[PDB]
């Protein structure tokens, strides 16, 4: 995308979202990141939406194929599951590479730095979902380390109702429950996050209240499933 203007890449990413062309959207946003400038709040959201949709389709396909493969146990199911898995890993490596070159190092404000470190935790988490063995251990630790740095910043620099802080806590709790075999840590984090947000809702406008309570309901939904 080197020959396209940054502003045109951003405009086309928004059009691709409306057209539900998420692979295109991700390619446009990768091109925008590679222009080398920092991303605004809205541009960060476009980057995240694009790749979340791409990797989300891959994860859903991998789960279907992994289930069929487990039931079977010719080479075809394993070969095709491996093909999807390699593609998924490639997308995760691409996102992680954008974060490392050079989005995180240039992110100084809490809102940008927390957002990117949460993304780093998420994409290592998606790698962990398909990893097998000792490779799994180092990938799991990379996810944990990114989430933990984001949590430390968010608790120092953001109010407990901030939607990014809430979504980080939600996703770190899912990491604990689904990846790290720590369901008690997942439940404790979700409960403490919910309760501290509740106590801060009185400070918010009607619109901010709506944004925060929407994510709080997701924390509650997980707590209901886990307890």
């Amino acid at each position: 995308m080197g020959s396209m203007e940054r502003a045109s890449l951003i405009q086309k990413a928004k059009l691709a979202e409306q057209a539900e062309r998420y692979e295109d959207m991700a390619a446009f946003m990768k091109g925008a990141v590679e222009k080398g400038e920092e991303l605004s709040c809205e541009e960060r959201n476009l980057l995240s939406v694009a790749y979340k949709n791409v990797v989300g389709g891959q994860r859903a396909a991998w789960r279907v194929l992994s289930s069929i493969e487990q039931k079977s146990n010719g080479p075809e199911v394993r070969e095709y599951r491996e093909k999807v898995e390699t593609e998924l890993q490639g997308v995760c490596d691409t996102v992680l590479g954008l974060l490392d070159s050079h989005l995180i190092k240039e992110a100084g404000d809490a809102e940008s730095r927390v957002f990117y470190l949460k993304m780093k935790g998420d994409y290592y988490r998606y790698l962990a979902e398909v990893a097998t063995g000792d490779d799994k251990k180092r990938i799991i630790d990379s996810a944990r380390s990114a989430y933990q740095e984001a949590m430390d910043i968010s608790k120092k620099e953001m109010p407990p109702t901030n939607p990014i802080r809430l979504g980080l806590a939600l996703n770190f709790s899912v990491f604990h429950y689904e990846i790290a075999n720590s369901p008690e840590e997942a439940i404790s984090l979700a409960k403490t996050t919910f309760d501290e947000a509740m106590a801060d809702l009185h400070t918010l406008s009607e619109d901010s209240y709506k944004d925060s309570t929407l994510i709080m309901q997701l924390l509650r939904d997980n707590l209901t499933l886990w307890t």
């Binding site: 979202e17 476009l46 939406v49 899912v174 886990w226």
Partner: peptide, 9 residues
Amino acid sequence: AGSIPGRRS
């Protein structure tokens, strides 16, 4: 369980 859906801007 459920992470941030995050599939719509």
